[PDB]
A paper describes a structure:
The ordered assembly of [name] protein into amyloid filaments defines a number of neurodegenerative diseases, also known as tauopathies; they are the most common proteinopathies of the human nervous system. The physiological function of [name] is to promote the assembly, and possibly stability, of microtubules. Here, we used cryo-EM to determine the structures of heparin-induced filaments assembled from recombinant full-length 4R [name] ([name], 441 amino acid isoform) and the corresponding 3R isoform (2N3R, 410 amino acid isoform) to resolutions sufficient for de novo atomic modelling. Our results show that heparin-induced [name] filaments consist of a mixture of at least four different conformations, whereas heparin-induced 2N3R filaments mainly adopt a single conformation.
Twister filaments have an almost constant width of 80 Å, and a crossover distance that is approximately two times shorter (~250 Å) than that of the snake filaments. The twister filament reconstruction, with an overall resolution of 3.3 Å and a helical twist of −3.38°, also allowed de novo atomic modelling. The ordered core of the twister filament is smaller than that of the snake filament, and is positioned much closer to the helical axis. The ordered core comprises only residues 274–321, i.e. the last residue of R1, all of R2 and half of R3. As in the snake filament, these are organised into a kinked hairpin structure of two cross-β stacks connected by a hammerhead arc. In the core, there are four β-strands, two from R2: β1 (274–284) and β2 (286–291), and two from R3: β3 (305–310) and β4 (313–321). In contrast, on the R2 side of the hairpin, the inner corner of the kink is formed by S285 and N286, extending β1 and shortening β2, compared to the snake filament. The change of R2 secondary structure in the twister filament reverses the interior/exterior orientations of four residues: the polar side-chains of D283 and S285 point towards the inside of the core, whereas hydrophobic residues L282 and L284 point outwards. This results in the twister filament core having a more polar interior, and a more hydrophobic exterior than that of the snake. Therefore, we chose not to build an atomic model of residues 293–303 in this part of the structure.
Numbering used by the authors:
A (entry chain B), B (entry chain A), C (entry chain C): 274 to 292, 304 to 321
Write the structure that this text describes.
Amino acid sequence: KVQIINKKLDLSNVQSKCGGSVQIVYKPVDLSKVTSK
Amino acid sequence: KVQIINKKLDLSNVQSKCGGSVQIVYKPVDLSKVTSK
Amino acid sequence: KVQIINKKLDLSNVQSKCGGSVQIVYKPVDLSKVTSK
């Protein structure tokens, strides 16, 4: 039982809670490869 | 039982709580490879 | 039971609490490889 995993998550704008601020992402460019050989 | 894992997460704008500030990401460029051989 | 893990996380803009300031990332360039052989 062999199990190979490649992961890369992209979360941009996230707020969370359990129980002013300025956040800017200006022009992101992504050339990023997910290769499995 | 063999299990190979490659991980690389990308979270840009994150706030969190459990119970002014300025954050700027200007033009990020990403050439970053996820190779599994 | 063999288990090989490669990890590299990217968190850019993070605030957190449990119970003015200026943070600038200007033009980050990332050529960084995740290889598993």
